[PDB]
Design a binder for this molecule. Structure first.
Ligand code: HEC
Ligand code: HEC
Ligand code: HEC
Ligand code: HEC
Ligand code: HEC
Length: 142
């Protein structure tokens, strides 16, 4: 269990993977998805706050760096078929500004029809009125 190493320090509930990715198979190796598949690997300096592991929806990494990890498994063509606005956001805002992957359910998969339009308004309006908007880290929808 390669996840057990992380869970020696991290909280198995809130920092455990309890969303859909807990039950999926990694298309690259046909094994269960592990922590490092999304976060990469800690260095000896990990506890100090260094650019070792990936951090999602936080200011440390550029949008392109954050989102590229998802694309080690996901396919841009298929994302379009699921939800058109994906393409224009792939390089522009953190995937995790919308998706929540650690909890038992993802906020995006439960949105009503109205909610799927309100997210556009909420974040685009924030960009117009918030001088400190940072596309790498948006707490708005959380
Ligand atoms: C203790 C020896 C740890 C082990 C083993 C792992 N993690 Fe860790 N992690 C630890 C600390 C004390 C911190 C805080 C560092 C800081 O920024 O001040 C972290 C941080 C993370 C994060 C970032 C969370 C955040 O605050 O934004 C992630 C995503 C993370 N750690 C992941 C992670 C993974 C994938 C691990 C196994 C490969 C792992 N950690 C092990 C402590 C320790
Ligand atoms: C492989 C190690 C993956 C990485 C890295 C990421 N995802 Fe993933 N995800 C993966 C699989 C095999 C599946 C099942 C569907 C499929 O494409 O085969 C998923 C599923 C999702 C979903 C949908 C969950 C649902 O409600 O059905 C979402 C929203 C999703 N994934 C998002 C996502 C994001 C934002 C990622 C980077 C932070 C990411 N995934 C990485 C495999 C893998
Ligand atoms: C809000 C504007 C979003 C951002 C930014 C990202 N995603 Fe998304 N995604 C969003 C919604 C509302 C949905 C549900 C679509 C539906 O009709 O139910 C999704 C879906 C996905 C999926 C699942 C697709 C499927 O086959 O069912 C995946 C794998 C996914 N999203 C991944 C993903 C990635 C990798 C993103 C950053 C590049 C990303 N999403 C951003 C809303 C939003
Ligand atoms: C993608 C499929 C992931 C896998 C597998 C793991 N993590 Fe993750 N992590 C991912 C995202 C998109 C986020 C942002 C929040 C969200 O739920 O969407 C995170 C967050 C973390 C954090 C920070 C938690 C916080 O500050 O609230 C930590 C410490 C963390 N992740 C660690 C971690 C561990 C130990 C994992 C294996 C059990 C693990 N992650 C898997 C994406 C994904
Ligand atoms: C942050 C949490 C966002 C949410 C939710 C949505 N959008 Fe967005 N969008 C966001 C950023 C940071 C940018 C880049 C702005 C820039 O100046 O480059 C965008 C961009 C768009 C675009 C641009 C298309 C283009 O001219 O190429 C469109 C058409 C767009 N966004 C639409 C859109 C929709 C329909 C959303 C709800 C599903 C939505 N956005 C949500 C940030 C965020």
């Amino acid at each position: 269990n390669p996840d057990a190493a992380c869970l020696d320090c991290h909280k198995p509930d809130t920092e455990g993977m309890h969303g859909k990715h807990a039950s999926v198979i990694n298309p690259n190796n046909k094994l269960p998805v592990t922590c490092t598949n999304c976060h990469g690997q800690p260095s000896p300096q990990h506890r100090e706050g260094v650019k070792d592991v990936m951090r999602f929806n936080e200011p440390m990494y550029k949008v392109g760096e954050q989102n590229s990890v998802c694309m080690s498994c996901h396919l841009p063509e298929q994302l379009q078929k699921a939800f058109w606005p994906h393409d224009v956001h792939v390089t522009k805002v953190a995937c995790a500004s919308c998706h929540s992957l650690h909890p038992q359910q993802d906020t995006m998969q439960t949105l009503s029809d109205k909610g799927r339009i309100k997210i556009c308004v909420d974040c685009h309006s924030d960009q117009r009125t918030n001088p400190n908007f940072n596309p790498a880290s948006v707490p708005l929808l959380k």
